[PDB]
Amino acid sequence: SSSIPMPAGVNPADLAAELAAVVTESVDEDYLLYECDGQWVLAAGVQAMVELDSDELRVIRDGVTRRQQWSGRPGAALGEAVDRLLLETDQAFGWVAFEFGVHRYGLQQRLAPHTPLARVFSPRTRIMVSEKEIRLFDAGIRHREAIDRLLATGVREVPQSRSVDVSDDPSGFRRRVAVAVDEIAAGRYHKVILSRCVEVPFAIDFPLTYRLGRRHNTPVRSFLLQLGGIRALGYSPELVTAVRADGVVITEPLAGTRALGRGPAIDRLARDDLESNSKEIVEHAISVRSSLEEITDIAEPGSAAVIDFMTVRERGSVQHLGSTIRARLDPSSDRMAALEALFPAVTASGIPKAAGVEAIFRLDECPRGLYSGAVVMLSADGGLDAALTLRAAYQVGGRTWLRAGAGIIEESEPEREFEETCEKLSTLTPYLVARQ
Ligand SMILES: C=C(Oc1cccc(C(=O)O)c1O)C(=O)O
């Protein structure tokens, strides 16, 4: 509801991130930038905030915090609070923790009090950036003036990045991998994704880092946020769930990994290896089966289908085997129920789910929080778009970190699994812009 023609030699990702940096800073506000199918949506300012925790639900608007106790499904509690936000505004944005998906698998009591499950907000203003134009939704005079100043200033040149060491293992990932391998060999579960955090020993400039890393990655979705004391950015390699206004539900499971970006002929050899490797084919097949079973739980009988099976999905520093699972949302179900059914992603949890999710509580640094959760965009028309939170950097308090994991199966070796985490961390490590 008002538009500005997109400038000549300006990329949408660069202008969207610059608007997020410069405009929100001049007004000192929180925001969330979400990239979805050629559109960069900047959700600027917080009109109301839904905070879902393990023990309480809070809705915060114009200084007033309303508290509620909730029981049963976290999805039903969040759904009720978000539908309310959406009666007022067209779109809501936020993040859903890994911990949101534990209730389905009987692990609710394992959550410590005040464990975040989700943060979803109604923005005061939305600025939508595409190749076509810049659209303004409910932008006030002060914001419009700040936008015009940004367009006249132009985009900042991105400085040289600063390197980070990913070779150290302070959290004993190699040790934790060996424990999971022993458990799988004993028949406890088939696969588990374990992870490790990597401390970034300097403050980074989130918008500039986002810009730099975006030039070198091909994610399904991307985000940049500053929300409630959390800064985060990511190049999501997978849609965990999308629910369209017409009832169509999609999930894009990934399983299997090879390095990418190492040179054309090297990348082709790795691509050919991935597509013919029995170990990778088996795991992908098993994951697509698990994913189909989950989507079946919320779909119209017999509406579930695999529309893309076992194809190479290129993701910057890595390439994965991917499938697309499509269904029709059953009338007895809803968008939150679909999210819960597909949560946490099989890709970043384990198989069987209940045993794999429980192994993560024992064998990984918990709560995972944003990592392996999702970044979400919800619409008043019933839409839900949820990007899997992998290939992301975070800043909370005075701490900046990266996080990456690997799929552990019976044949897994701690050394090769550690190397696999290095490949995934390389989606970001060469593009970290130091804060100036
Ligand atoms: C979990 C991470 O990445 C992954 C993505 C897709 C598949 C796998 C897998 O192991 O089959 C995988 O490990 C991470 O980037 O932290």
UniProtKB/Swiss-Prot annotation:
Alphabetical list of InterPro entries matching this protein: ADC_synthase, Anth_synth_I-like, Chorismate_C, Salicylate_synthase
Q: Which residues does the record give as Mg(2+) binding sites?
A: E283, E417, E420
Sorted UniProt keywords: Isomerase, Lyase, Magnesium, Metal-binding
Query: What Gene3D superfamilies does this protein map onto?
Result: Anthranilate synthase
Q: Which SUPFAM superfamilies match?
A: ADC synthase
Q: Which reaction does it catalyse?
A: chorismate = isochorismate; isochorismate = salicylate + pyruvate; chorismate = prephenate
Instruction: Indicate whether NADP appears among the record's keywords.
Output: no
Report if keyword Metal-binding is assigned: yes
Gene Ontology MF, one: isochorismate pyruvate lyase activity
Query: So where does substrate get bound?
Result: G256, T257, Y371, R391, G405, A406, G407, K424
Q: Where is the active site?
A: E238
Task: Name which cysteines form disulfide bonds.
Answer: none
The residues that cross the membrane are none
GO biological-process terms attached to the record: catechol-containing siderophore biosynthetic process; L-tryptophan biosynthetic process; salicylic acid biosynthetic process
Instruction: Name the needed cofactors.
Output: Mg(2+)
**Pathway(s) annotated for this protein in UniProt:** Siderophore biosynthesis; mycobactin biosynthesis
Q: What is its EC number?
A: 5.4.99.5, 4.2.99.21, 5.4.4.2
State whether it acts alone or in a complex, and with which partners, per the record: Monomer.
Q: Matching PANTHER family, A to Z?
A: AMINOBENZOATE/ANTHRANILATE SYNTHASE, ISOCHORISMATE SYNTHASE MENF
What family classification does the UniProt entry report for this protein? Belongs to the anthranilate synthase component I family. Salicylate synthase subfamily.
- Explain the purpose of this protein: Involved in the incorporation of salicylate into the virulence-conferring salicylate-based siderophore mycobactin. Catalyzes the initial conversion of chorismate to yield the intermediate isochorismate (isochorismate synthase activity), and the subsequent elimination of the enolpyruvyl side chain in a lyase reaction to give salicylate (isochorismate pyruvate-lyase activity). In the absence of magnesium, MbtI displays a chorismate mutase activity and converts chorismate to prephenate.
The protein here is known as Salicylate synthase
Species whose genome carries this gene = Mycobacterium tuberculosis (strain CDC 1551 / Oshkosh)
